[PDB]
Design an enzyme around this catalytic site. Structure first.
Site, PDB file in Angstrom:
ATOM      1  N   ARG A   1      -7.786   2.378 -52.304  1.00 16.83           N
ATOM      2  CA  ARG A   1      -6.616   2.916 -51.646  1.00 16.83           C
ATOM      3  C   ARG A   1      -6.583   2.479 -50.205  1.00 16.83           C
ATOM      4  NH1 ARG A   1      -6.179   7.966 -49.428  1.00 16.83           N
ATOM      5  NH2 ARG A   1      -4.131   8.312 -48.488  1.00 16.83           N
TER       6      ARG A   1
ATOM      7  N   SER B   1      -0.376   7.193 -52.153  1.00  9.70           N
ATOM      8  CA  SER B   1      -1.301   8.273 -52.356  1.00  9.70           C
ATOM      9  C   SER B   1      -2.176   7.878 -53.558  1.00  9.70           C
ATOM     10  CB  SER B   1      -0.508   9.558 -52.584  1.00  9.70           C
ATOM     11  OG  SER B   1      -0.140   9.696 -53.953  1.00  9.70           O
TER      12      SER B   1
ATOM     13  N   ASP C   1       5.599  22.854 -56.560  1.00 11.97           N
ATOM     14  CA  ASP C   1       6.142  24.140 -56.146  1.00 11.97           C
ATOM     15  C   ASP C   1       7.073  24.030 -54.937  1.00 11.97           C
ATOM     16  OD1 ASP C   1       4.919  25.515 -58.329  1.00 11.97           O
ATOM     17  OD2 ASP C   1       2.998  25.382 -57.253  1.00 11.97           O
TER      18      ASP C   1
ATOM     19  N   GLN D   1       9.782  13.283 -54.605  1.00 15.09           N
ATOM     20  CA  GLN D   1       9.278  14.244 -53.635  1.00 15.09           C
ATOM     21  C   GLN D   1      10.338  14.564 -52.547  1.00 15.09           C
ATOM     22  OE1 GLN D   1       5.406  13.430 -50.874  1.00 15.09           O
ATOM     23  NE2 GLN D   1       7.505  13.040 -50.014  1.00 15.09           N
TER      24      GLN D   1
ATOM     25  N   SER E   1      -0.676  17.496 -62.604  1.00 14.42           N
ATOM     26  CA  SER E   1      -0.452  18.468 -61.529  1.00 14.42           C
ATOM     27  C   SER E   1      -1.540  18.302 -60.474  1.00 14.42           C
ATOM     28  CB  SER E   1      -0.440  19.886 -62.109  1.00 14.42           C
ATOM     29  OG  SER E   1      -0.291  20.803 -61.072  1.00 14.42           O
ATOM     30  N   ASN E   2      -1.159  17.842 -59.294  1.00 16.70           N
ATOM     31  CA  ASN E   2      -2.132  17.632 -58.243  1.00 16.70           C
ATOM     32  C   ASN E   2      -2.382  18.874 -57.394  1.00 16.70           C
ATOM     33  OD1 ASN E   2      -4.038  16.470 -56.557  1.00 16.70           O
ATOM     34  ND2 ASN E   2      -2.528  15.161 -55.484  1.00 16.70           N
TER      35      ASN E   2
ATOM     36  N   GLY F   1      -8.267  18.029 -59.095  1.00 19.71           N
ATOM     37  CA  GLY F   1      -8.780  18.851 -58.043  1.00 19.71           C
ATOM     38  C   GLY F   1      -8.990  18.033 -56.786  1.00 19.71           C
TER      39      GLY F   1
ATOM     40  N   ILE G   1     -10.562  15.821 -54.183  1.00 22.37           N
ATOM     41  CA  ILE G   1     -11.592  14.811 -53.915  1.00 22.37           C
ATOM     42  C   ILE G   1     -12.590  15.226 -52.810  1.00 22.37           C
ATOM     43  CG2 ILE G   1     -12.012  12.435 -53.148  1.00 22.37           C
ATOM     44  CD1 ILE G   1      -9.254  11.754 -54.229  1.00 22.37           C
TER      45      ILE G   1
ATOM     46  N   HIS H   1      -4.078  22.554 -79.251  1.00 24.25           N
ATOM     47  CA  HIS H   1      -5.084  22.269 -80.296  1.00 24.25           C
ATOM     48  C   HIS H   1      -4.552  22.344 -81.765  1.00 24.25           C
ATOM     49  CE1 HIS H   1      -8.850  21.246 -81.936  1.00 24.25           C
ATOM     50  NE2 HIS H   1      -9.517  21.484 -80.822  1.00 24.25           N
TER      51      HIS H   1
ATOM     52  N   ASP I   1      -7.091  17.164 -81.519  1.00 31.21           N
ATOM     53  CA  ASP I   1      -8.470  17.585 -81.619  1.00 31.21           C
ATOM     54  C   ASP I   1      -9.242  17.163 -80.350  1.00 31.21           C
ATOM     55  OD1 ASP I   1      -9.091  14.937 -81.835  1.00 31.21           O
ATOM     56  OD2 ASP I   1      -9.712  15.065 -83.958  1.00 31.21           O
TER      57      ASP I   1
END
Ligand SMILES: CC(C)C(=O)SCCNC(=O)CCNC(=O)[C@H](O)C(C)(C)COP(=O)(O)OP(=O)(O)OC[C@H]1O[C@@H](n2cnc3c(N)ncnc32)[C@H](O)[C@@H]1OP(=O)(O)O
Ligand SMILES: CC(C)C(=O)SCCNC(=O)CCNC(=O)[C@H](O)C(C)(C)COP(=O)(O)OP(=O)(O)OC[C@H]1O[C@@H](n2cnc3c(N)ncnc32)[C@H](O)[C@@H]1OP(=O)(O)O
Ligand SMILES: CC(C)C(=O)SCCNC(=O)CCNC(=O)[C@H](O)C(C)(C)COP(=O)(O)OP(=O)(O)OC[C@H]1O[C@@H](n2cnc3c(N)ncnc32)[C@H](O)[C@@H]1OP(=O)(O)O
Ligand SMILES: CC(C)C(=O)SCCNC(=O)CCNC(=O)[C@H](O)C(C)(C)COP(=O)(O)OP(=O)(O)OC[C@H]1O[C@@H](n2cnc3c(N)ncnc32)[C@H](O)[C@@H]1OP(=O)(O)O
Ligand SMILES: [Cl-]
Ligand SMILES: [Cl-]
Ligand SMILES: [Cl-]
Ligand SMILES: [Cl-]
Lengths: 234, 234, 234, 131
Positions: free
Chosen positions: A43, A58, A101, A130, A151-152, A176, A178, A204, A208
């Site tokens: 990056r 990003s 959100d 965004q 979802s970041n 999650g 970094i 499920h 599987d």
């Protein structure tokens, strides 16, 4: 000072209905950790080229493209199911939703056809969604047709999570924060590794654990060894 | 060597019903790790001042005060919701429950009004509830009126969890075992850090991801840097 | 390169039924990390003896025996519950399921009566079940009477998971990938430790938090300290 | 039989992996003297990998009516300064372009060369715009 009672009103109504609908889907959670050191470096290397071109680069564009590459091999994760999981529709288009959100709550527009879009294009479409998303200006087309969701959460905090599948989709990943942690390299010496957690939820009834796990590994091999994506891109 | 059937009777029935009513809540999970190195230290220092004043001081009063702090900023997390989620009641008092298991099953006493109590007072109320809890003598008033719950699973063991929200509350948090791990400091050197895992569950019908994550960050910062708590206390 | 709809048919129909049934169960999740450094060593010294008797020894037999030893102490976990959870049947036999996905997804055969079998006996039996399972030739009796399930997700990848309980069982565990991490020993020195995650789901209608947790520590202690298993084996 | 020059069709819509597949194919055919008309025809631009045998620099001959060709030399490890200023093992290859200067000017070939090079010096740069 005293208890206040209020209607859940208007746009806040959609979340109630989306999340209630998700009660019908038996969620299997599968988590992992991804070593994003080579990706972080990467990056940095491309940051100036994308700034020159007007885009902020990003991690998401990479997560999206790897997810897509992964969905070519495991197409059942890019599918829907009917009322009682009587029938499955495999979806050709990778319309990958990005959870957001807003002051008005949960909004999930998607990047269309990620499978035929480059990382740079994905970056551009993200910026667009965004900006629109924060101006309350998303179109109907921006919102419908989603086949799969990332979802970041990591942009705010967290490690692991349990994200809620959005009907009619069958899967969602949460990424999650970094974080630099001590880990061994091949020589058995303690290194600085940039570590990210991923948490998938899958319906499920038709996915599987081997499917979601192997998809996760492929997704993860792509990000841990970026060049691996190069092989089949055109 | 033989199978045996028994009725679920009495006090065991209550757990069946609470947990069954929780099935109507679409649970979103969000987790994190917390560096408790300053707090462990800080606690050793206050131990003898508490011992002199007659109180066993653990971590929970800190966790309690910090939760109440965050809830002031995110009062939707201390709210309740009705039959099919058409009305939010925002609840003034921070009645924070401590989930306990008894030789009699699940019992959730709460500390009334955490928002107007001090860590010391919270510790005193915790000591009272443990005395009574382990003796089977908790009273109606100690049990009812809960607005929010924490569950110290890590007093026995564990890292992450998926706790189950207690209706009509909208969130619950679980705390893992505080445990020393290798972690980098500012200088990029390998230290001993007292790490605890936190796992929150929230009613995604009215609580979005960003609210639980920002709440969690706030709670976390109060605990990672206890000094911050100092600022706004009276 | 377009959408394809298709019937959920044949064997995949069973997965829909089972997982839909599991919605009635308020799943509680508890997770932890287990230090398997001694076990890994231990297994290395045993492979030769078992290879010499015509048996591949994986980690699973250990995990199964330890689960079994734990279920003797916490028998509610090896129990079944009725229609609206009004009666519990405590099961004498520990018939531990091994979750497998075949070219037809979910198949869960079990090892009968683990409580009275040696680790070598359990390995043997697991070998019988693999041979059969990958030939699509598991029998009826291999598949019934299960009382508790393990699912070794980590033979593909993964750290933590939220596995789905299989009615009428009340618990399942998922085992992550065993992975060398930097960990402090007693001297406070950074060591290579062979670390594995375990994630437990339990039916919180009748199993409480302290029960899963203490069961998990017991299981965990048997694996961290394999000598502990000797004490009561005959 | 001497000089033979098949071309990989429409490289711009193929991946590295598809290109590899096509090479093996053309290499196989070439060896058996079995290349089709269609393999040999329509080329628009040529590379010559001289360094699969030897050499560093070269002056390759353009193939009318194309306007450019690149020769690639042998990849050799050579001592080179890194970002610090310390000597490193660097895996070094020469490239020699010839271009029809009636229509191709110096900046074009050179600017072309730089772009190619940086794609190869920083392969991640290729990730960016592939689909
Ligand atoms: O937009 P997204 O694609 O969702 O990420 P952003 O909103 O740009 O994130 C803002 C910052 O958080 C960073 N970010 C985004 N996601 C993460 C995760 N998951 N972990 C750590 N940091 C993150 C991102 O790199 C930005 O930092 P800088 O570019 O270095 O200033
Ligand atoms: O509920 P609690 O407030 O934790 O009551 P207690 O079980 O008495 O907690 C006190 C002890 O448990 C230990 N405890 C409590 N919570 C934790 C967490 N989650 N991690 C590790 N140890 C804990 C803590 O180390 C205290 O040890 P001492 O300093 O030796 O007294
Ligand atoms: O299914 P199992 O009964 O656990 O055995 P297998 O999947 O056949 O084992 C294949 C290998 O993966 C290994 N494997 C299996 N489970 C794990 C876990 N959870 N972590 C890491 N590696 C594993 C297993 O030990 C075998 O190791 P080798 O000695 O290198 O052959
Ligand atoms: O194998 P072949 O069928 O002979 O394929 P070719 O591409 O023609 O070359 C053969 C080998 O020489 C190598 N070769 C090809 N080009 C070069 C250059 N320019 N420099 C050094 N070595 C080269 C090539 O990498 C092959 O070997 P390995 O890397 O060791 O796998
Ligand atoms: Cl579920
Ligand atoms: Cl860690
Ligand atoms: Cl859910
Ligand atoms: Cl639940």
């Amino acid at each position: 000072g005293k208890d206040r009672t209020e209607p859940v009103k208007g746009f806040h109504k959609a979340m109630v209905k989306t999340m209630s609908a998700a009660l019908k889907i038996p969620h299997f959670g599968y988590c992992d950790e991804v070593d994003l050191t080579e990706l972080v470096k990467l990056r940095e290397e491309l940051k100036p080229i994308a700034f020159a071109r007007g885009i902020k680069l990003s991690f998401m564009p990479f997560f999206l493209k790897a997810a897509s590459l992964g969905l070519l091999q495991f197409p059942i994760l890019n599918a829907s199911v009917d009322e009682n999981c009587q029938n499955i529709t495999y979806k050709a288009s990778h319309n990958i939703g990005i959870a957001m959100d807003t002051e008005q709550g949960l909004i999930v527009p998607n990047v269309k056809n990620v499978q035929i879009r480059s990382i740079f294009e994905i970056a551009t479409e993200l910026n667009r969604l965004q900006k629109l998303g924060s101006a309350g200006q998303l179109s109907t087309n921006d919102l419908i047709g989603g086949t799969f969701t990332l979802s970041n959460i990591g942009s705010i905090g967290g490690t692991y999570a349990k994200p809620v599948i959005l009907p009619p989709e069958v899967a969602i990943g949460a990424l999650g924060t970094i974080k630099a942690l001590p880990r061994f390299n091949e020589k058995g010496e303690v290194c600085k590794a940039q570590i990210m957690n991923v948490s998938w939820s899958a319906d499920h009834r038709i996915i599987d654990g081997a499917t979601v796990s192997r998809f996760s590994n492929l997704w993860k091999s792509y990000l841990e060894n970026p060049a691996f994506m190069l092989l089949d891109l055109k």
